[PDB]
Amino acid sequence: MRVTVYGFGSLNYYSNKLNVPEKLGGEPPYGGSAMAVEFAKAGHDVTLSDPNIDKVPDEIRKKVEDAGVKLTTDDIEAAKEAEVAILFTPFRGGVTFKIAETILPYLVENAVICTTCTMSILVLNSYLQNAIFLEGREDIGFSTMHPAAIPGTPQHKHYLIATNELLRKPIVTEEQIEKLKKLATDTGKEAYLLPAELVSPVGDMGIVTTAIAFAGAIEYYKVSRDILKTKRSMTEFQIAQSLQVISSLVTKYGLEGLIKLLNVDAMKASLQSMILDKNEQPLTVTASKLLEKIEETIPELIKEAENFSPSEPTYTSAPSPMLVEHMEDLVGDDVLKGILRESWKKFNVSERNK
Amino acid sequence: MRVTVYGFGSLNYYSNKLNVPEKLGGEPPYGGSAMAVEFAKAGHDVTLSDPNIDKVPDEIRKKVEDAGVKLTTDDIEAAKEAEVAILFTPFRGGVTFKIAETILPYLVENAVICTTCTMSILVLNSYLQNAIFLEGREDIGFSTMHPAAIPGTPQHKHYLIATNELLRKPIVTEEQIEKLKKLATDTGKEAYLLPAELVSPVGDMGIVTTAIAFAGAIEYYKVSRDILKTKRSMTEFQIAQSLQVISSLVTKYGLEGLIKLLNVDAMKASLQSMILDKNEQPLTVTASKLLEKIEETIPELIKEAENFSPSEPTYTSAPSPMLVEHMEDLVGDDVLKGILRESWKKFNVSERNK
Ligand SMILES: Nc1nc(=O)c2c([nH]1)NC[C@@H]1CN(c3ccc(C(=O)N[C@@H](CCC(=O)O)C(=O)O)cc3)C=[N+]21
Ligand SMILES: Nc1nc(=O)c2c([nH]1)NC[C@@H]1CN(c3ccc(C(=O)N[C@@H](CCC(=O)O)C(=O)O)cc3)C=[N+]21
Ligand code: NA
Ligand code: NA
Ligand code: NA
Ligand code: NA
Ligand code: NA
Ligand code: NA
């Protein structure tokens, strides 16, 4: 199939800033370039478009070209025969939007546009609605080829592919998803099909918080089921509440607010009474140990927390899905969609140091 | 001061169901009874009201009475001179509401009603609004004496006391809070003053999820700051999103939905690329290890997840505080308060096994 990868990947970031050969493995080139080489080795007709191809050293460029990858700096020309367009584009503001809007009229009929860790597919799909109406591109599909790893490292053994699950309207077809699954299996990677909204919390760097919180909830569920002998309904309410509260505090008041309002000393004290089976509670015990010296590890945050004051009140435990249902019933989806747009932009209050 | 503790504490639960002397320490009686004995030893005029005082063994009853605690089965008479009324009442439906509504006209002027781990003070305060209007008890204060531990165990060294912080309207006065702080310091306990909405996620059994997720977010913040060298705004967005998503999934689809939709295999794979400094990432490493055998530990949930299907779509990442602000602007608080009522009731979809 004809695949165009947009973005080589930052050579300096993966070599000097984050020592990827040392911390994870493999050798440069990492990122979009590695993805392209793999698709080309599988026998796909691959093009890699990047405006800075001339800054790539000759030895690395030659290695990429030898695999069969066609290199170019022309994004529009690179889109012309593309059945799959993968955006390995900057975190930087507006670069991904610009590229997607520019290639949109040139992609082949039924082409699918895929984002990676730097852009939510839902944010991109929403941003392009008027362009789709104007260019009559309702045939274009939207999904992801999220590596949830750095391509070129031994850890990259899969791709997270966004599906229509949990969405009100579809953004991709079954045929398009099959093409993405094939790109993954043709290159020896496991294809993980997830609801589109979950690709980011599962694939991005936040997987650390996602997995620790999820593992912590299962640990609390096992203590509740086996030791406290409490009701499932009570256990699920406690998990939902704890996580909604922390999320609300970080969103509204930042990490400094989260720390000042929850009270680390209180959490540490309270947690002592839930250490009921040391052998069956690895995370509780590990977390308790961390809370003991937490102030030495994050002095900069402890200082912000000491100078923090909540500017206005809020309902930290209000369950989002319940507020979402009420809002949808009261004003409808389009009106509600003009909220998930303002959230991702923060990736405002953070800028103003709030 | 005159304090009335409502509820002895369940002798069978703390001795046979949860082996408290073995798992935590100390000796029976645990709970409300222990709290009463401590306030009586400090020199307070203490009354303990419980309908089942005659079921308490004589030796345990004698030990309580010897400390100066007045035992009774009459809740109304027990309220008559009470400056502080502490509800160490059942998790069981409507028992706490009944007692609070019944003693409300008899408490002394400016008395404060305190809940413990079995009832949110905000839920109770909301439920009693018409009774307060009718009995002209706008002088009554609402707060907590949450042990965030089992009173009588060596771990119980503090109390969580609800304040007006983060609330739109106050529920307690400074004088009332000072009385609670005194009950705590008079009995050698640390007084932890928290915003009323945070007493439950910090004090209740959910502290396991609260502390693991919080510790996990700080661990991810340190990896982001020191190793990835990414922006604070990006880090806080990732923490907020991860936790909002997990909370939304558990609230709407239960633990079985959470497990099926996030995909444990995907989370485990993705997490491998964020293990960047083993020595500085205890929770990531511990969580990764747990995900490896997670299916053997919770087969009952893995089976529900296999038979799970989302009934309707939702926005799992919608930030609650943003939806709260919009709702408050669109319909006002009273209209919005008729939502936090339906949430706590679940402590519906859970009952229907959804
Ligand atoms: N499951 C998984 N998902 C990931 O998404 C993932 C991972 N594992 N392992 C490590 C790579 C690395 N990573 C970065 C995050 C932010 C910046 C970032 O903020 N870069 C800025 C500037 C960085 C700088 O110059 O210091 C930028 O490109 O604009 C970079 C790299 C996430 N990764
Ligand atoms: N920081 C902290 N906060 C706590 O709130 C806390 C703690 N540590 N350590 C352990 C005690 C124990 N605990 C229970 C939770 C639910 C039931 C429960 O659901 N009981 C049911 C029935 C129990 C049965 O009969 O099996 C009931 O009373 O109706 C009991 C006990 C929370 N505790
Ligand atoms: Na996230
Ligand atoms: Na902040
Ligand atoms: Na809901
Ligand atoms: Na909780
Ligand atoms: Na459930
Ligand atoms: Na907000």
Largest CA distance in chain B: 65
Label residue A293 left, alpha or beta by phi (over 0 means left) and psi (-120 to 50 means alpha): alpha
Contacts of B342 in chain A (CB under 8 A): 322
What residue type is assigned to position A144 of the chain? T
Length of chain A counted residue by residue: 354
Instruction: Verify whether the Cβ–Cβ distance B351 to A322 is below 8 Å.
Output: no
**A115 forms bridges with which residues in the sheet?**
A87, A144
Report the b/e string of B132-149 with b at 16+ CB within 10 A.
Answer: eeeeebeebbbbbbbbbb
CB B204 near ligand 2, within 6 Å: yes
From the list B200, B271, B327, the residue facing A241 with the nearest CB is B200
Lookup: tokens for A32: 């979009």
Instruction: Verify whether the Cβ–Cβ distance A290 to B310 is below 8 Å.
Output: no
The answer to whether residues A121 and A115 touch, using CB atoms and an 8 Å cutoff, is yes
Which residues have a C–N gap over 2.5 Å right after them in chain B? 347
- The SS3 of residue B340 is helix
* Residue to probe by mutation, ligand 1, list B226, B228, B267, most atoms within 8 Å of CB: B228
* Method of determination used here: X-ray
What residue type is assigned to position A327 of the chain? M
Burial of B189 (0-12, 13-18, 19+ CB in 10 A): buried
Q: How many CB atoms lie within 10 A of CB A251?
A: 27
- SS3 string of chain A? CEEEEECCCCHHHHHHHCCHHHHCCCCCCCCHHHHHHHHHHCCCEEEEECCCHHHCCHHHHHHHHHCCCEEECCHHHHHCCCCEEEECCCCCCCHHHHHHHHHCCCCCCCCEEEECCCCCHHHHHHHCHHHHHHHCCCCCEEEECECCCCECECCCCEEEEEECCCCCCCCCCHHHHHHHHHHHHHCCCEEEEEEHHHHHHHHCCCHHHHHHHHHHHHHHHHHHHHHHCCCHHHHHHHHHHHHHHHHHHHHHHHHHHHHHHHCHHHHHHHHHHHCCCHHHCHHHHHHHHHHHCHHHHCHHHHHHHHCCCCCCCCCCCCCHHHHHHHHHHHHCHHHHHHHHHHHHHCCCCCCCCC
Q: Atom 23 (ligand 2): residue with closest C-alpha?
A: A230
CA distance B204 to A316: 16
Contacts of A344 in chain B (CB under 8 A): 237
**A138 forms bridges with which residues in the sheet?**
none
Residue for token pair 């913040």 = B221
CA distance A216 to A283: 6
Helix axes A320-331, B232-262, angle to 10 degrees: 90
Give the nearest chain A residue to B288 (CA atoms): A211
From the list A166, A267, A325, the residue facing B207 with the nearest CB is A267
CA distance B209 to A320: 18
H/E stretch holding B255: helix B232-262
CA distance B162 to B196: 4
Q: Is the peptide bond before A299 cis (omega within 30 degrees of 0)?
A: no
Fold classification of A2-203 is Rossmann fold (3.40.50)
CA distance A13 to A9: 9
Please give the span between the terminal C-alpha atoms of chain B, in angstroms, as a whole number. 48
Q: Could you give phi then psi for residue B142, rounded to 5 degrees? A: -130, 125
Q: Computed from CA positions of residues B290, B296, B300, B304, in that sequence, does the dihedral angle turn out positive or negative?
A: positive
CB A95 near ligand 1, within 6 Å: no
Lookup: tokens for A305: 């927390």
Q: How many CB atoms lie within 10 A of CB B349?
A: 15
Give the nearest chain B residue to A205 (CA atoms): B274
The answer to whether residues B266 and A273 touch, using CB atoms and an 8 Å cutoff, is no
Q: Atom 20 (ligand 2): residue with closest C-alpha?
A: A230
- DSSP per-residue letters across B6-58: E----HHIIIIIS-HHHHT---S--THHHHHHHHHHTT-EEEEE-TTGGGS-H
CA distance A52 to A33: 12
Burial of A183 (0-12, 13-18, 19+ CB in 10 A): buried
Q: Is the peptide bond before A29 cis (omega within 30 degrees of 0)?
A: yes
Contacts of A255 in chain B (CB under 8 A): 217-218, 221, 232, 236, 239
Residue for token pair 């080829």 = A145
Q: Computed from CA positions of residues A20, A22, A28, A33, in that sequence, does the dihedral angle turn out positive or negative?
A: negative
- DSSP per-residue letters across B257-312: HHHHHH-HHHHHHHHGGG---GGG-HHHHHHHHHHHTHHHH-HHHHHHHHT---SS
Q: What is the DSSP letter of B316?
A: T
- DSSP per-residue letters across B202-251: HHSTTHHHHHHHHHHHHHHHHHIIIII---HHHHHHHHHHHHHHHHHHHH
Residue for token pair 């995909």 = B263
Name the residues around ion ligand 5, CB cutoff 5 A: A 321-322; B 252
Q: Atom 14 (ligand 1): residue with closest C-alpha?
A: B228
Rounded to the nearest angstrom, the minimum Cα separation between B48 and chain A is 24
The answer to whether residues A216 and B293 touch, using CB atoms and an 8 Å cutoff, is no
